[PDB]
A and B are shown apart, each in its own frame.
With several copies, the nearest count.
Chain A
Amino acid sequence: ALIVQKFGGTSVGTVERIEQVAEKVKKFREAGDDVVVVVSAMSGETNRLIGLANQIMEQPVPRELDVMVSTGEQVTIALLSMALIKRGVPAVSYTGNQVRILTDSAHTKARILHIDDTHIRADLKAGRVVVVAGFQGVDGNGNITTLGRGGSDTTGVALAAALKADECQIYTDVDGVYTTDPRVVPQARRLDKITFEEMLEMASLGSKVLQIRAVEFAGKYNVPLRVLHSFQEGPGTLITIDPIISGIAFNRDEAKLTIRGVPDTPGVAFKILGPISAANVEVDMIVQNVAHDNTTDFTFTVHRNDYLNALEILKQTAANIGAREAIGDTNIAKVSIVGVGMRSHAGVASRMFEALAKESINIQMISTSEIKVSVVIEEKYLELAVRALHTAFELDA
């Protein structure tokens, strides 16, 4: 089997760290696995080089910035090849341009267009470990490019798709993706497998370490993704596609906006949300129930930072379209159960509502998906709701 492994800046932050990465990679190769390793620049180099450029200009030239920042990964790919060769395991380093990770022309934010499997496949069949520079490529004209944040993660997943790897392993600080935030529920436990769809629905698990885009890419190409702690304490979590509920997700940074008595006619929903979109306000939830006497209510949710901007915009719309009023509330939290199998089982929503009612928590809003039920409650109840649902659905440990 073929495996793609990606190592973050911390993992390769020092020579001592790189030597350790090599030792592990040695173990996989020793097991009969062909290995492709994706590495990032050692810690501080990417920020240090960017800082060197901003030292030169306030808005540094995107095309030239790419050739500066891209060098960091090139130092790293060589050291790990050396630390591997020293350990008796053959390795070859690859530049972005050497493999041929063909990309966009958007300079500090380039997107992968095509990856040549021919040169790497030959190195793998010759028994060598391929060490690829993460976060780089070149456009159709030969100009160097950088992917953007999470670029290395993207590269690893893109290599996994083009090479049709068995799985792509992302090494990081966390031991996996958990049933819920362990800071909130100490009995939260590590998950063995979840679908791409479940992982995306539990957004807050999405963070700085694993970029959301990476989860998105692997899903498009059915790339088995494993998240593990760098030192293999455990198997990690396998995110692939195929326990009544997988997990509990929540968001405390929410504010709700409702426009009441809206005329129930085509185009009105566009009038409500259109101007919000024009202002670049992120919208999370949108809820509209059935009209009565040709009027309805329309509610959506935004981050607290943008609450008043969205509210003043909505008040304008309520004046424009003749609605009864526009009102908002920032004292809310969103709590969700996600899991496949919700689709095949009756009563999952019943059990969630019962568990909230046992705790005297009033449900203000309900929104849904095939694999998700979301509830909006008063912010004070957030941790209690999360714990109530967590024992109720038997995820406790």
Chain B
Amino acid sequence: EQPIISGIAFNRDEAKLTIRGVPDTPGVAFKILGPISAANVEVDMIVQNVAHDNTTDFTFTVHRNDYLNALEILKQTAANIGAREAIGDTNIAKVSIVGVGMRSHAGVASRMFEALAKESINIQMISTSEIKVSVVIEEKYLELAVRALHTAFELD
């Protein structure tokens, strides 16, 4: 209820796409996102964690209007490159803490995860930038999550 931030931002118009068990070799990220880009679908969030036993998972987000289109291109790519599956979700929201301060990522992110945890909001994705910490949650909890974050932090 004291930490300082510029604001809390969110986006309800987002759809999640994940291709799981993709081979961890150069050129794959381009094979996944190349055809999405070729279709002119805009991409917002992209998340990839470390490979384990030579496969990794690759997730990105698109505007809700492009979900079905991106899903089918990703599903066709998933079969082409031997990935395990391609899965999609439309019932998500992206909420972010902005104006974070570069040296302080560990503090504000600790508080944000704490605030979400008090309510029982499960975090599905986490991404970071120099001035932002971003979270992906189920869409229905958005209002509770924003209210929790407004209490947890101090707006500048």
Contact = CB atoms under 8 A, between A and B. Distances in A.
A–B direct touch in complex (beta carbons closer than 8 A): yes
Interface of A: 197, 200-201, 203, 206, 212, 216, 220, 256, 258, 260, 264-267, 269-270, 273-274, 276-277, 281-292, 296-299, 345-347, 349-351, 353-354, 356-357, 360-370, 372-374
B40 interface: yes
Contacts of B130: 200-201, 203, 369, 372
Contact of A350 (B16, B30, B113, B122): B30
A88 B50 CA distance: 59
Contact of B50 (A357, A364, A369): A364
B48 A362 contact: no
B156 A220 contact: yes
Given A273-B113, A282-B103, A374-B129, A349 B49 contact: no
Interface of B: 6, 16, 18, 20, 24-27, 29-30, 33-34, 36-38, 40-52, 57-59, 99, 101-103, 105-107, 109-110, 113-114, 116-117, 119-134, 156
B103 to A, nearest CB: 6
Contact of B129 (A297, A299, A367): A367
Contacts of B129: 201, 367-369, 372, 374
B156 A288 contact: no
B57 A290 contact: yes
Contact of A291 (B33, B124, B133): B124
A189 B130 CA distance: 23
Q: Determine the main DSSP class of A at the interface with B.
A: mixed
Given A256-B50, A282-B105, A349-B46, A290 B125 contact: yes
Secondary structure of the B side of the interface?
mixed
Contact of B124 (A220, A290, A365, A368): A290
B24 A362 contact: yes
